[PDB]
Design a binder for this molecule. Sequence first.
Ligand SMILES: [K+]
Ligand SMILES: [K+]
Ligand SMILES: [Mg+2]
Ligand SMILES: [Mg+2]
Ligand SMILES: [Mg+2]
Ligand SMILES: [Mg+2]
Ligand SMILES: [Mg+2]
Ligand SMILES: [Mg+2]
Ligand SMILES: [Mg+2]
Ligand SMILES: [Mg+2]
Ligand SMILES: [Mg+2]
Ligand SMILES: [Mg+2]
Ligand SMILES: [Mg+2]
Ligand SMILES: [Mg+2]
Ligand SMILES: [Mg+2]
Ligand SMILES: [Mg+2]
Ligand SMILES: [Mg+2]
Ligand SMILES: [Mg+2]
Ligand SMILES: [Mg+2]
Ligand SMILES: [Mg+2]
Ligand SMILES: [Mg+2]
Ligand SMILES: [Mg+2]
Ligand SMILES: [Mg+2]
Ligand SMILES: [Mg+2]
Lengths: 99, 148, 51, 203, 193
Amino acid sequence: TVKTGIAIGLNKGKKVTSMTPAPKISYKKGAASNRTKFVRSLVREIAGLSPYERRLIDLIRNSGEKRARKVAKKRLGSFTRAKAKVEEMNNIIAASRRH
Amino acid sequence: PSRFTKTRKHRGHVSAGKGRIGKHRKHPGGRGMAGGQHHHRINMDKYHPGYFGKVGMRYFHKQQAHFWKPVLNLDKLWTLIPEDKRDQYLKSASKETAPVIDTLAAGYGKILGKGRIPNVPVIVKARFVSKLAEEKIRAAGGVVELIA
Amino acid sequence: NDVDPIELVVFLPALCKKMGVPYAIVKGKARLGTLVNQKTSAVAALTEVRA
Amino acid sequence: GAYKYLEELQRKKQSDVLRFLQRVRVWEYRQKNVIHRAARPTRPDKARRLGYKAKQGFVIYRVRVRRGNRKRPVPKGATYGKPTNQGVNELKYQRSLRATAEERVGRRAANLRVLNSYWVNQDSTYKYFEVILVDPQHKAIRRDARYNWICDPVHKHREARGLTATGKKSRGINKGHKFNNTKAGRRKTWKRQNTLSLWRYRK
Amino acid sequence: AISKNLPILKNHFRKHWQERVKVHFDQAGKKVSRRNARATRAAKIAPRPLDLLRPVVRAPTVKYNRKVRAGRGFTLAEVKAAGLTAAYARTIGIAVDHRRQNRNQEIFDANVQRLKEYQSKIIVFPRNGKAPEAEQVLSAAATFPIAQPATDVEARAVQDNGESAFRTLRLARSEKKFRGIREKRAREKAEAE
RNA sequence: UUGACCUCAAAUCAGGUAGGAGUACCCGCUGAACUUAAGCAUAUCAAUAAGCGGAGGAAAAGAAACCAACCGGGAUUGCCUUAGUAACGGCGAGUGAAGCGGCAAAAGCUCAAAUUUGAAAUCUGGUACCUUCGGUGCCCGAGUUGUAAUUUGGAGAGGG
RNA sequence: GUUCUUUGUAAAGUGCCUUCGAAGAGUCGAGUUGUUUGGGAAUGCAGCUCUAAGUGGGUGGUAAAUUCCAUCUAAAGCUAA
Ligand SMILES: [K+]
Ligand SMILES: [K+]
Ligand SMILES: [Mg+2]
Ligand SMILES: [Mg+2]
Ligand SMILES: [Mg+2]
Ligand SMILES: [Mg+2]
Ligand SMILES: [Mg+2]
Ligand SMILES: [Mg+2]
Ligand SMILES: [Mg+2]
Ligand SMILES: [Mg+2]
Ligand SMILES: [Mg+2]
Ligand SMILES: [Mg+2]
Ligand SMILES: [Mg+2]
Ligand SMILES: [Mg+2]
Ligand SMILES: [Mg+2]
Ligand SMILES: [Mg+2]
Ligand SMILES: [Mg+2]
Ligand SMILES: [Mg+2]
Ligand SMILES: [Mg+2]
Ligand SMILES: [Mg+2]
Ligand SMILES: [Mg+2]
Ligand SMILES: [Mg+2]
Ligand SMILES: [Mg+2]
Ligand SMILES: [Mg+2]
């Protein structure tokens, strides 16, 4: 990431003395927050799975993670959300009776 | 001003210089660029070849600052040196204490090699340089220093 | 047991179970309000009690 | 506190508990009047998030708005123009149902100021909203400098002028290249871009 | 209406453009009004230079990155290094910008230095004192002008090492162009069965 | 049987508030066609006229879920530019911004989400007195389904 | 400028170490439809259907998968010139 000093090429740009400014408290907007982790776990206990989450668990158990990811991409917006939802569903499956 | 216009002279002449047979009507050929392909095709093909159709590829959200690179030819290469010091650098053309020229500070991105420079070493700082420009600078005994 | 928007207290049994806090679903937010000198309270807690 | 639990639970709208509550509450709201005063917020955490406080001068109104497109009100579907404007049945009313809800609520309670609103329920025919309103004449609001800004006359019918959250959303009031058409006002930007500026010494 | 050999014009006057024509007849009146407003603002505010001290800042977009200019406000790091708090600087006439960040030691040092010069060249009056008239100067920007940093010396010795700067640029461009394909080739050549 | 609570009502109940006008400028909704394309349907006129709702002395916007790709800028607005350009378009007629740069003016901020829990510390109203754009005392009431203080991401909080 | 006032062992700011650091949901986002935009495999807006997450989310002007990077912090609010 150190500049090469010339106006073309991979790390193009002027060589300057870097500083590494202090980290903003933003960029931590989606942080861990034990409080919210506890609350989310408790709410997941109180309210169970959505119908599509139950269907995704059934698909993971029977027809495979690829089919589950396809159905999750159809249900949710995008492929990344589908992957995250399938990972959460199979974590739920693991944390269920088949520990 | 109005008093020097031909319409003052056309007072008293019925057609105002616009003809009796083909008068001054509203839009006898259509408005604007109408008929450039149909009844103004001759005036389009002549004096405007290439007008119709597409010719290359598109560029969404093009920023000209990305392509900002003003070119300075070697033929000047010295107007960037102030006139007061120009003579004393032209004399005493020494490889040591050669004048340093910041072309980027002068406001140029690339140095081109059109002209020929006197046989005086000059340290040229540029973002980009043409091959012949650099060759002539080294022949004159200077060097090109790449900057950003 | 009669909190009109029930979401305010539905998690309370599960939270009490998770933290090991004894809880009773009792009759009357008005009764808890009489406990705490309010019209209604919807909850009442004992943390420290005399010997 | 309990508001974080309310917030997280409210996001599980297709869970069994929230489905049951949705059914019961949508039936009750459909039984009540189209616009009716709500004694308290149905979602108190959401009301706090949107600015509501449990003090005198804060008012909640529940409102029912018909769902779907905006059919062109032309008689017999005749538009009397070019085919590009013959559309009747697939026109979308470039303003939100939430905006309609709070506009009707403001018209009803013209003495109050619409502070905010939030979705609470929906069926096929209706969408249900709760509108948070402030009494600018109440002394509890005229004092309490955190809220007496809404007592200024410049905030009359902000829901009618699109100055609430849904109003700014519908007007497209956001920063960035995606909102070049609507950043300082769509019509204002159009006027600026279609104004011919001539100086004394012409440029 | 395509006449004899003339350039194709693009005059956009097909709307009701005469409904929106702004002739700046009030250029002189507005200049007088701006001068009056500046005079009354200078009189109204305490002896104070009619604007806040602004930091030195590097322009983006290489068309302009060669030059330095006044920025919005000093960063929190710059204020702390100059020895003030942001709240106090905002009240003693320093623009503070929480958004700008310091990644360039030269610019950071220059801003800290001009903050120190500002503190040395201003007099903060006591809240409950005598406060003699201090001969208000109208421009902190004029008091502390922004200087373009000097990069090199007027004359220097030639240090040609046979580098062929043109070849250097060509090779850097080619290395950037083929970096991904060479990385992919290395990955498939280090397969190790 | 009595006393609450919740919800919902009534009163020429105590005190208030809204309507309507103006509408040059402003914030939105709705919304054409004449016209141009030498015809004409997409397009253009025009996100305009007409219609409707809502303000002020300005309005709106506004302190980045911004711009950028830099050696990085740093709320919003406006002017000069960018630029009749990138781009859109029976790629026809036509249309058409934005970053940077100079300048005018500059100003920054606050809620929700925190247990005050050794003390609802908060507030409307009535009443009495007073030095009355209000204060003090008392009394109801609001409020624990949360009113104060404390914190707003630039941070900040709890301990030492 | 001057006088009664004295606020208050009340409020605020700053260094060091430690543990933390709550940050907005039928919302973002996606599909489709209509409208609109210079925004072009879709600029904003709106209807309907689906509907998130928290080392997340949005953006990075060619759709997609994979891997990085950069930059901000939406779905709440006030503010003079
Ligand atoms: K003729
Ligand atoms: K019509
Ligand atoms: Mg004659
Ligand atoms: Mg004649
Ligand atoms: Mg009440
Ligand atoms: Mg409808
Ligand atoms: Mg009465
Ligand atoms: Mg006409
Ligand atoms: Mg025609
Ligand atoms: Mg004709
Ligand atoms: Mg005709
Ligand atoms: Mg009109
Ligand atoms: Mg008025
Ligand atoms: Mg003004
Ligand atoms: Mg305003
Ligand atoms: Mg902020
Ligand atoms: Mg800006
Ligand atoms: Mg030009
Ligand atoms: Mg147009
Ligand atoms: Mg504090
Ligand atoms: Mg937020
Ligand atoms: Mg429309
Ligand atoms: Mg890209
Ligand atoms: Mg505002």
